[PDB]
Amino acid sequence: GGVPDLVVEQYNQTILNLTSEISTLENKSAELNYTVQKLQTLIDNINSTLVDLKW
Amino acid sequence: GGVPDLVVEQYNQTILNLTSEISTLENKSAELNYTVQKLQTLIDNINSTLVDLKW
Amino acid sequence: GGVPDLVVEQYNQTILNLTSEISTLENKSAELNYTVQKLQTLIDNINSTLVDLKW
Amino acid sequence: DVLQENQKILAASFNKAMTNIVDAFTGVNDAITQTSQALQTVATALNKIQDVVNQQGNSLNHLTSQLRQNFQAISSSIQAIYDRLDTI
Amino acid sequence: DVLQENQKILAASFNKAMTNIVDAFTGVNDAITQTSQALQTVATALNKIQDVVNQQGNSLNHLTSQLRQNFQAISSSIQAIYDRLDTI
Amino acid sequence: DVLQENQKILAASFNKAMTNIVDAFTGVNDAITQTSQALQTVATALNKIQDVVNQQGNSLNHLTSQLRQNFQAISSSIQAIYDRLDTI
């Protein structure tokens, strides 16, 4: 018998980096919400154009 | 020589919980699909307003 | 004393397969971009319909 | 007659506008359909990720337990060896 | 009178068109709201995934270090045992 | 003249409506652009997640193999030790 040959290889950790993607999605969500606010006013403007004509 | 000092630290498992996010995305997908159905009828209604005038 | 009973169970690796989802999202992004291009022309067409009438 | 001519212009403009508005809403509706499908796709992806990531967490948890038990066994076995060496 | 009749037709068509256009933009706006919420939801999910996946990476890294140290200890201990056996 | 006045009203309403419809479709189109970019961003994120999660799965798989081999070596070494102790 003899001393065992024990080997544990070096671990090389890949980091998952989603910071840019997270920020991008937060920004896109904010842009869409602002657009919703602007579109509500535009919809009201269109609705105001209905005519009430008499002949 | 002597007995080796062998230590393996307690593992504290963080659970990835995406159940709320998954349900939310399923609900949003369903809402958009319903809206698509409603918009098709509205588009047909707009298309019906074309005028065929004679002078 | 005696020889220690050392057991390390067989590891069964589940593969995370997102290839179909990734391709689908790439295709949807491309479809929306094409639609944006088509809608710009339609918006210009609508804008061209403003009337300049005199009485 | 300016009334008839203006009416002709307004009718042509209205019809062109409505045709293009119909086409534009149809394109928007296609975009909404694509987005609905994409959101389902993301939900499916998240479910898969949750599955595999928690399986790997479980595996790490269980491996740490097995390792602690294996090293405790080794410690005891080597302790008995050194005790017998000390007796010898 | 064809002018009055045509004006009546055009006014009715314009009002029906605008009512439906208002309703359609309102539906589109609801879709945009739902999409905005969904994108926030995806951002939150990605943040959670990044958190847990890098914690598991850290755990694997640290476990590999602990294991290397434990096996080095075992190697040294067994070396001393075999040296004493060779002396005996 | 009610025909001329009604035509004036209808023309003003049509032009205001079309201006606002153009602006609204432009805003919707911006929203569709933002959504397209977001979907590309999600695709990129999923690709990164798939990469790292399967690397960690591979690492666990390989670590389990190394560990099984290391513990088999330890078992054999300690077996020889106990055999020699039994001879002594």
Curated annotation (Swiss-Prot), chains A, B, C:
Coiled coil residues, start to end: 14-55
Subcellular location: Virion membrane; Host endoplasmic reticulum-Golgi intermediate compartment membrane
Domain of life: Viruses
Assembly, per entry: Homotrimer. During virus morphogenesis, found in a complex with M and HE proteins. Interacts with host ANPEP.
Membership in a protein family: Belongs to the alphacoronaviruses spike protein family.
Domain notes from UniProt: The KxHxx motif seems to function as an ER retrieval signal.
Task performed by this protein: S1 region attaches the virion to the cell membrane by interacting with host ANPEP/aminopeptidase N, initiating the infection. Binding to the receptor probably induces conformational changes in the S glycoprotein unmasking the fusion peptide of S2 region and activating membranes fusion. S2 region belongs to the class I viral fusion protein. Under the current model, the protein has at least 3 conformational states: pre-fusion native state, pre-hairpin intermediate state, and post-fusion hairpin state.
Protein name listed in UniProt: Spike glycoprotein
Organism of derivation: Human coronavirus 229E (HCoV-229E)
